[PDB]
């Protein structure tokens, strides 16, 4: 499913993401935008290390979910990577919460550093009623 901006914003707020571990909703929106374009079925194979990024937040199979074919991988979210390709984003959100419970926080995603950090991210939630 490809979410429309405000639809996703309202969905994330309902799932308790606003302010989760100090991360504002606008930051989560900026992250989803740059990671997948708000697309839940987005996947990207990293030929250099044989891992794959899955879903709306593009979580890596080496650490967050199990896909079986990734060498020396762990599954911190205790989920099959297939769970991160559903139209319903409940599992992906539960896993995102887990990622930020680590010390790096939102910085765990390099795209957040490049496209969201120290920027005016208000545009991502403007007019959405959140």
Curated annotation (Swiss-Prot):
Catalyzed reaction equations: Hydrolysis of (1->4)-beta-linkages between N-acetylmuramic acid and N-acetyl-D-glucosamine residues in a peptidoglycan and between N-acetyl-D-glucosamine residues in chitodextrins
Protein keywords: Amyloid, Amyloidosis, Antimicrobial, Bacteriolytic enzyme, Disease variant, Disulfide bond, Glycosidase, Hydrolase, Secreted, Signal
A cellular component term, taken from the record's GO annotations: tertiary granule lumen
Start and end residues of each C-type lysozyme domain: 1-130
InterPro entries the UniProt entry points to: Glyco_hydro_22, Glyco_hydro_22_CS, Glyco_hydro_22_lys, Lysozyme-like_dom_sf
UniProt entry tagged with the keyword Translocase: no
Enzyme class: hydrolase
Disulfide bridges in this chain: 6-128, 30-116, 65-81, 77-95
Highest rank taxon of the organism: Eukaryota
Subcellular locations according to the entry: Secreted
The UniProt record lists the keyword Disulfide bond: yes
Entries under Gene3D superfamilies matching the protein: 1.10.530.10
Main location: secreted
Enzyme active site: 35, 53
One Pfam family linked to the record: Lys
GO MF annotations, alphabetized: identical protein binding; lysozyme activity
Listed EC numbers: 3.2.1.17
Gene Ontology annotations of biological process type: antimicrobial humoral response; defense response to bacterium; defense response to Gram-negative bacterium; defense response to Gram-positive bacterium; inflammatory response; killing of cells of another organism
Other remarks on this protein: Lysozyme C is capable of both hydrolysis and transglycosylation; it also shows a slight esterase activity. It acts rapidly on both peptide-substituted and unsubstituted peptidoglycan, and slowly on chitin oligosaccharides.
Assembly behavior: Monomer.
Similarity annotation: Belongs to the glycosyl hydrolase 22 family.
PANTHER family from the UniProt entry: LYSOZYME C
Medical condition linked: Amyloidosis, hereditary systemic 5: A form of hereditary systemic amyloidosis, a disorder characterized by amyloid deposition in multiple tissues resulting in a wide clinical spectrum. AMYLD5 primarily affects the viscera, and the predominant clinical features are renal dysfunction of varying severity, and intra-abdominal bleeding. Inheritance is autosomal dominant.
Job of this protein: Lysozymes have primarily a bacteriolytic function; those in tissues and body fluids are associated with the monocyte-macrophage system and enhance the activity of immunoagents.
Name of the protein: Lysozyme C
Natural source organism: Homo sapiens (Human)
Lineage of source species: Eukaryota, Metazoa, Chordata, Craniata, Vertebrata
Name of the gene: LYZ
